[PDB]
Write a protein that binds this DNA or RNA. Sequence first.
DNA 1: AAAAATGCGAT
DNA 2: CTAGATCGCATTTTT
DNA 3: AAAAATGCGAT
DNA 4: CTAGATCGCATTTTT
Lengths: 200, 200
Amino acid sequence: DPTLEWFLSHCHIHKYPSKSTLIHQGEKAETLYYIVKGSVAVLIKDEEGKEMILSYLNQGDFIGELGLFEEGQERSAWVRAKTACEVAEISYKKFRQLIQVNPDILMRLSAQMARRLQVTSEKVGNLAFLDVTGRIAQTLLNLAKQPDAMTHPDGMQIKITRQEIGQIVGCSRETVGRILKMLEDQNLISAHGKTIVVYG
Amino acid sequence: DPTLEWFLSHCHIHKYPSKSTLIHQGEKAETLYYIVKGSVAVLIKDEEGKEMILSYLNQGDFIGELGLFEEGQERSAWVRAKTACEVAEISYKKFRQLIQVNPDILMRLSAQMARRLQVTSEKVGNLAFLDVTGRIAQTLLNLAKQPDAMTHPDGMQIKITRQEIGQIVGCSRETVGRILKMLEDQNLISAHGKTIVVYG
DNA sequence: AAAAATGCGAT
DNA sequence: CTAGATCGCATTTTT
DNA sequence: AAAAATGCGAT
DNA sequence: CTAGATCGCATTTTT
Ligand SMILES: Nc1ncnc2c1ncn2[C@@H]1O[C@@H]2COP(=O)(O)O[C@H]2[C@H]1O
Ligand SMILES: Nc1ncnc2c1ncn2[C@@H]1O[C@@H]2COP(=O)(O)O[C@H]2[C@H]1O
Ligand SMILES: Nc1ncnc2c1ncn2[C@@H]1O[C@@H]2COP(=O)(O)O[C@H]2[C@H]1O
Ligand SMILES: Nc1ncnc2c1ncn2[C@@H]1O[C@@H]2COP(=O)(O)O[C@H]2[C@H]1O
């Protein structure tokens, strides 16, 4: 779209290698991010260090928008890179100015926030209403419908650790591994290492 | 603020008695709400009918904003009145027009969405990281810091059923009642019926 | 060759 | 009862 | 006088 | 093991 090259034209483009940190929880927020290319993960932590992924984010997504509305706000979560990234970055102070010339970009953001709120809420009912099995099941399903999913003769093929599915459904990596074995025991999937074939 | 009487001036003011439904899950969303007075509850459901409160909302809060950004969107949750209410209502079609004359009101909304996303996320870690006891504890604490909380000689006094705390922390009313007894067993609170004194 | 991820499995 | 978290390391799977 | 909310407590 | 969900109704607490 037209207003994109414009917005982009006023941003600092930065790169972040996979596994790195773009945003740190608790720090003063003054910057806005826009993923130009790559995937990141939004995570929160417990006192011990156990992580909980709240979302994944991709091209076309803004990051660090939450601290843009109320003075002296802190980052609400850690944001780490899943792959290599190319993020457009801009100063809140700056951004505020762009949306005056054109509030339409502010709209584009608010929409995202709306979608985000929808899914988080959806994620709340999930933790409240489904048991691990169901949560893992719904996850392999979502994962398989993703574009980065590999096409395989018996269904779709994904790659991910028991550990990370655990940080997604909110359980222990041990519980994942066991539910996994059961889902295979029931001929629903077929896992070998990080590779899981979700049968169709 | 000035832009308020303005926005308000273009809304239909409606009243809703306590226990009633302002928004129904799954229906076509075309209206925006603004709580002028009163408290509501945002809830989602499981196939059985068990409810899960995602939030409470008060004066100064917008409701039904999520379906305002993408064409043909459906309400994401039920919104029910906790008390009697006076809600300002307006057509999305209309609203869209007000934020052109003044995108500043759109800002006010987006902020709310930001805060909402923060707390829901906070609520996700809670379900993932805390056990019922801890969740109930954090809840009586929050409830007691609320303005509608009654001031009592030994601390703060709140009124609420075991059933509803359950729909808040996401557990069975039976589990609430038992944790309650334990918290009293430990001289932390003192419950008699819907009344609970959270000792200070 | 390492660093990460796993599973044990009886509590 | 039913569903999950633990634990310290050696064994196995991935960068 | 009802309608709602509770607790049983052994599984 | 530790933490929670169940179940059908009579008893108790609230509108
Ligand atoms: N309730 C939870 N219990 C345990 N781990 C959790 C929870 N919620 C999120 N997690 C995280 O998810 C991870 C799954 O695998 P791990 O056992 O290695 O470590 C777990 C934590 O880091
Ligand atoms: N629940 C969520 N879902 C999706 N993205 C989120 C969520 N919570 C936080 N984020 C993103 O992660 C960012 C962390 O820092 P900010 O608070 O600046 O802004 C946050 C959002 O961009
Ligand atoms: N995981 C859950 N298990 C049971 N009830 C739940 C859950 N999440 C939300 N709830 C709701 O919270 C209510 C608490 O009291 P009830 O047992 O009457 O009914 C429960 C459901 O309506
Ligand atoms: N997680 C949430 N926290 C707070 N309010 C919410 C949440 N999810 C939905 N709502 C509100 O409830 C409304 C239900 O209908 P809408 O989707 O129009 O818009 C929704 C929001 O106004």
